[PDB]
Amino acid sequence: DSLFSTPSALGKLQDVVNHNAQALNTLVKQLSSKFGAISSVLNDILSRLDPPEAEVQIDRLITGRLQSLQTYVTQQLIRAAEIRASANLAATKMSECV
Amino acid sequence: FASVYAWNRTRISNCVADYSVLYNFAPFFAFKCYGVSPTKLNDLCFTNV
Numbered sequence: 118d119s120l121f122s123t124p125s126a127l128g129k130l131q132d133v134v135n136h137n138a139q140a141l142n143t144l145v146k147q148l149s150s151k152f153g154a155i156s157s158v159l160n161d162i163l164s165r166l167d168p169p170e171a172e173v174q175i176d177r178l179i180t181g182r183l184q185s186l187q188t189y190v191t192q193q194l195i196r197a198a199e200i201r202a203s204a205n206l207a208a209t210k211m212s213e214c215v
Numbered sequence: 216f217a218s219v220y221a222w223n224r225t226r227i228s229n230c231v232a233d234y235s236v237l238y239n240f241a242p243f244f245a246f247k248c249y250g251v252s253p254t255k256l257n258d259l260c261f262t263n264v
């Protein structure tokens with residue numbers, strides 16, 4: 118009765134799902150940014166500019182997408198350390214409470 | 216040709232733009248292209264020119 122009625126009962130497990138699904142949306146929505154280049158599509162840059170000038174625009178995309186990946190991994194390592202803290206607490210309760 | 220203060224703009228639409236004809240006037244002092252490389256102009260579609 119207190120779980121089939123109260124909606125925010127499993128709000129700790131659902132919050133874990135939300136944070137990981139929200140970080141992937143931001144990671145894949147950073148592919149639409151330009152970071153200073155003329156376009157966010159590598160095909161457009163490759164099919165509009167000579168190789169001497171295409172590398173200038175492409176390097177703006179790489180350094181911006183590379184920094185978007187590092188932000189995702191670093192905050193994933195930080196968040197995975199909270200989960201392991203709660204996984205060590207649940208393993209302690211499983212062996213001492215149960 | 217018109218004066219610089221009354222420059223004449225010509226619409227270009229619904230045609231085939233073979234840019235190889237541009238070099239018939241060979242003595243070009245400057246051919247600076249912005250955004251598009253001058254060699255790839257024959258493989259692109261333009262909304263308005």
Ligand SMILES: *[C@@H]1O[C@H](CO)[C@@H](O)[C@H](O)[C@H]1NC(C)=O
Pocket residue numbers: 216217223224225226
């Ligand atoms: C201006 O350009 C238009 C459109 O191409 C052309 O019909 C017209 O003759 C031009 N006028 C002058 C004064 O060059």
